[PDB]
């Protein structure tokens, strides 16, 4: 009866999305407004920013009614 | 989000015939309580009185203070849009039902302003009147739209296209340009019914090329190698079918004339 | 209307709550009477989150109209059955309860939404031993680049008390840590009268921060110094406690908001797979 993690999965109809830890690398931070100190103080940062416009960009690209 | 909400299961039709015969559906029915003559109007003049006040809803909005944020003033004209694809202009008058949109649009986006200010956007008694005719008319609208009121529009798709294009298309060396024209195309979209047919990235997408393709940088790349569509041509194929049909909609939209809107406005005001 | 009005259920400061049954499907649910404005701003928010999202630990919304909320019906709620003495909170039934909870949240976060108001009474149970988070009228959706007097006090996290305006996941992360302890402890664990006094009593259970744990700490508006305490470490806090749920604690209390470990690195967590597994629902202690 033990418990294992599976992931959610959740079907986007659109083109796949990098994790939220690989943006950095990748490069996109380059391209979004920085997190200011007191915005990282409270555990906001610029990557959640990127994460969520890039997600509703390839959300149902791919999907007709 | 948008692939699992309520836009997508219940406010996204499979074609324009679906959006013209639920406007017909809507008149008739109108036609049917009411009998039970040429005061009546048909639907073509309830879809041009419709877009004159979408029109008036988008320049109170331009008008208003504080300013109001983009998804605000789009979430209303959505509001516009669901609520008279399923009622008749002569039932309830879209003069009250567009500050009515406004109105619920702002407490859904979280744009708090309290309501003698909303008012005083209004150009005092008649003020009052109309903060009264919205307070009836909010719950009505609520009903109207079934209870959904989460609006995706596709502006936030349009920024995250554009850190996609800054990020893995080195080939178009400034995403700047593609705004100004980008942001018009995307405003001539929205005057049209795409948004009741298309997904908000699609959108979003269709705008970015056409501003692409005005410029005369062609991104057919960006598609099939930067957005891995090369395994799949069908994927392709649909996608560029649903931004030339996009285009071609928006390329035969009518915009309202004077005469003929103030000719409805009187027949409109007859009815009332 | 469709539902006949069986019982009073409870009072609220925005509503009224009643245990009716429909005849359509003749089932049980709970109806929520709101009581120049116009419609009320935490109803309409709550209907606006609510019918966009769909999860077996999250309250469905089965219907509204003009106005009253139609919700699942809920036996008790986690704060009953922590304040009751007859049950006893076997290490099986919290890790059950933590794993709804988790899961509940990670559904929640992943559609970039803060519940902001989770505690023991929010989470709902039902006859069957589902939990579903309730109580959206405070919740909110981040990620868009908020005033700070938001959680109950008791479950308020650091950043919150010094004035962060801008935050994430961790604000409702602490909650969770906050609840696992009221689990635990089957008493509130940081019970403070005020702002400063819940601060106070934080850094004295947990010890004061210093810029290594917190790089920013002092840019925070509200922000002032406080004693330094050594705070007491959690193996006391918690005599009866495994090395992974200490571990888990201690990723759920981490003083860095960003730091702090979210639902989905929780639920991946060692004390989750370790044996014993979460009770089944169907057995999970009832009052
Ligand atoms: N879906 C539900 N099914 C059964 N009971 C519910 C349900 N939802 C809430 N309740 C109960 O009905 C009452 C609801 O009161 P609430 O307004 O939700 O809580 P409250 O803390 O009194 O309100 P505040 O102080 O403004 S946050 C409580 O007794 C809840 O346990
Ligand atoms: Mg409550």
Redo the contacts between chains.
Sequence with gaps: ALYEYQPLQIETYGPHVPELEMLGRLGYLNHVRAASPQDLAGGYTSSLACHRALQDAFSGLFWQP | ??????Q?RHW???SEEQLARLRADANRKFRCKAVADPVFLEPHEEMTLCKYYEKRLLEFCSVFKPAMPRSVVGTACMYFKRFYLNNSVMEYHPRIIMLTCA?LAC??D?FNV???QFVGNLRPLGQEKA?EQ??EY??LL??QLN????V?NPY?????????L??RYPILENPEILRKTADDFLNRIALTDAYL?Y????I??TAILSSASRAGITMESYLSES??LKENRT?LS??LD?MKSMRNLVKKYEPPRSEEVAVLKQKLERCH | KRYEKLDFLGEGQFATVYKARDKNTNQIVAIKKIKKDGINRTALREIKLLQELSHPNIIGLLDAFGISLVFDFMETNLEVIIKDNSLVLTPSHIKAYMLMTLQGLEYLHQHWILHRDLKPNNLLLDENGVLKLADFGLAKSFGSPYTHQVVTRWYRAPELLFGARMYGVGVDMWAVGCILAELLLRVPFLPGDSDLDQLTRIFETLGTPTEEQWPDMCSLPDYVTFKSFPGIPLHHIFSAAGDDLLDLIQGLFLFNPCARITATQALKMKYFSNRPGPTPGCQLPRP
């Design positions: 989000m948008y692939h699992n909400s309520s997508k996204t039709f499979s109105f407490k859904v979280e309290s309501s003698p903060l919205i307070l909010e719950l609520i009903q209870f959904h009121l989460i995706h936030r798709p349009f920024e995250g296209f554009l850190i996609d800054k990020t047919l997904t908000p990235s699609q979003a997408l957005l891995m994927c649909q996608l649903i």
